[PDB]
User: Fold this.
Amino acid sequence: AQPFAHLTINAASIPSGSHKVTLSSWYHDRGWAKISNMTLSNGKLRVNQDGFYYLYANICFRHHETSGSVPTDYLQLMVYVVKTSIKIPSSHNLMKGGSTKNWSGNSEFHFYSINVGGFFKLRAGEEISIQVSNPSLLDPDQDATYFGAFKVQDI
Amino acid sequence: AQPFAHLTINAASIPSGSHKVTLSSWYHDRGWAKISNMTLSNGKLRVNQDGFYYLYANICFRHHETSGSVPTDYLQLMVYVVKTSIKIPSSHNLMKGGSTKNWSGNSEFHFYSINVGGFFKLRAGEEISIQVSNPSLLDPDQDATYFGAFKVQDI
Amino acid sequence: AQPFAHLTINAASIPSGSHKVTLSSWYHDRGWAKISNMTLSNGKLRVNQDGFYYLYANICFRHHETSGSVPTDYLQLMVYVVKTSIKIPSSHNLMKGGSTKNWSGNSEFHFYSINVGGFFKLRAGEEISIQVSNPSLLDPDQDATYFGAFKVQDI
Amino acid sequence: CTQERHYEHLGRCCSRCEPGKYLSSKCTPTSDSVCLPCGPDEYLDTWNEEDKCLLHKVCDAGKALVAVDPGNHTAPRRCACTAGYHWNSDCECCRRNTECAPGFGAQHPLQLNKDTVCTPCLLGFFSDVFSSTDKCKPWTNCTLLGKLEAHQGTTESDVVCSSS
Amino acid sequence: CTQERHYEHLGRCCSRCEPGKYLSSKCTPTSDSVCLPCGPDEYLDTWNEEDKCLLHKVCDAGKALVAVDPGNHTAPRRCACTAGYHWNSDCECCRRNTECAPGFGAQHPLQLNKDTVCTPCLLGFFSDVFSSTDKCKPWTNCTLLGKLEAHQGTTESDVVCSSS
Amino acid sequence: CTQERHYEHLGRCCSRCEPGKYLSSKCTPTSDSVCLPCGPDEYLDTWNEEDKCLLHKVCDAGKALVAVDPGNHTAPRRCACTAGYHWNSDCECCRRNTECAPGFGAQHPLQLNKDTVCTPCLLGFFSDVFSSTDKCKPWTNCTLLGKLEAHQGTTESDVVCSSS
Assistant:
């Protein structure tokens, strides 16, 4: 029936920087990852059928001692759900979530998750994508990092 | 078809206190803000048609150095999704989210977001509204602070 | 019509440990708690009809001085949304959320909430349940701790 | 038609439900409202048109809250913060009562679930401590110690007594 | 057919909407695109096929942001971080400008909404402080103090002057 | 009919799928279950009725986790916390192994992915440090240093040797 998608992070292709990036690899056909009447190119979820969809994302950040010290500096773990036209320049923010964090403590492990969800009017050709602040901090688990959409009503 | 609403904070009318307040100004017709078969008076989203709706809210709190020092005291950033009858006294909580925070550090910027969502049975005449603890800390962005609803099933 | 459920924590039966546990008592017929064409046994929400459901959970953790000191040690407040077959051994994680926290400060009160939501393919006989890390820290309020589901589409 | 028991549906002036019960069925053109009693731990305290009763507040010990009035099908459960705390509506939590500084004392009697209000110590009394419970103590009488008053007292300190 | 004003719908080469307005209705086989003007605080700055205009950025004072260009129905609102800060795209926030350490000074003129770039002090100048605004100061001229140069200066310290 | 290969559908005793594959189609009245093999990085390790195979655990280096058994279409991938850590099911994370205090030592051999268990040093041995790896050291033999034993040792300290 209606279009939908539940994309889980491609555990094998997460960028390694500390700078904000658009995630460009998600699974769409394994585990809980699934897609229907929607297109996934490179981190871009293309709407193939006009309508009002509920869009959501769960992002998990994690750090472990063995990976090295957490430098004493500015830490803001963010997720931005972005909308772009498959043929119209700059993307725009639909949803934003996150938190400034201090992970300098002497604990072995640090963990943090963000969730965002909203009802949006989408057109075929429009694309939904995910941006995160610290990619190397991303948790690769399918139950941890993912985004999706499902149509709830026609335009 | 079904009723729905995605209300984004009216960036120009956020109260300035530190005390809990019911937000009374949201956009309903600009940017991502939209409403259909639902009524918005003053922060109160009135249900115009019985049914089971999914209700959600994303609230972003932020503080910057230039705004002054963050007093060393109790900081609990909360959001309460409240239900009230357009003709029945005290409101009741549907959903609650938030976190106690310490923003005394020497960092220039502090940021934090909360999200809540649930499935509820609503009647025409019932109103949904948002309460937050520290209004002057609210992020005015449309992708940051908002709430909505969409009907998924008849009663 | 479609199946659904909004389960609120059974304020009178929350386990008291500090170890991860599957919550086994929710209300299904009082306040905002409701269920339809779905079965709730002991913390296990059984799907009675194949389909794609949106699953969600809001978990609130809280601590007050009068309850004693918060030991200086590892604090990770987590929620795991788990799927199990009413006749197939080990459960698997669908969704994960949470945060490492330090609640050693001298503040009277500590509070923290997590939310998770996703679109999943479920079969009659499959069960959805909730696991949390620190049960004695759970907020008993109906607007604070709960999980639910609603069918949005047939298989 | 009045509200203290009525509302309007299918052109009819239907009867509103009484505290202790909710409307199971709106009035039809042939019958009136069907009002059923509130279930366990539920209540409605006004003439209503609710399809479900309100659930009672949990007086969570974990929030330093205790039941002052258990409530029932007609009245809501009332809670209070335990000793040393008072309910704060901004945090919806039990906040530690504020301390009176030296020179002031807690006004008595101490109100349950309310913050302590401080007032300065008046002539003949003092407080040399930070407390949210103590009121100003009266100066020591040196003769009870078998002594004379070496030094007068203040609002912040007690008199000084010395063996003559 | 070209894009600088056209797009394709029902087999027809329909006209694209001009900045300042969005398409209210896609072209039918009998009529062309119906483009209506952007509402208050909205804008579209390109020939488009949008069913709604873009909402203007909020230049939140609370983020130390200020409007450099108010924007309008044709152009987007432009914001800048106020003095002492520069916009950081990773945090999408106004970050404190970095400080130049002793021996270096801030390159001038200071760019609005950009981070300060440091450069070492060259012969005859010094900086003995951590600052994100100050450039290297020239050494003191002892004769203006009515003195002689006791000690030569460095990049980190000023000359030392002594009354002869 | 048995389960080690069967289940019930349309009144029929249909065959269950074998590890390595999932059921693509439930049995119809005319044919039996259609079981297809698990795709890449997937597995099912039991006779099942699953419409999709289970995805393998990620042995995230970022969690100090490493693959002990890569797993395959029939067996799940097994992970272990790297040296110095052990898996904790409450946090579902690799926790730092606990340290044995002076007077005790780590029991050997050290179990992979398990916490270190401490035991007190017995006569002739000591440990004067906090370590999650070291076992009790035996007392020094003074004659190897060309000395005599000035002081006996304890569980917390080594013997004291002195040149005669």
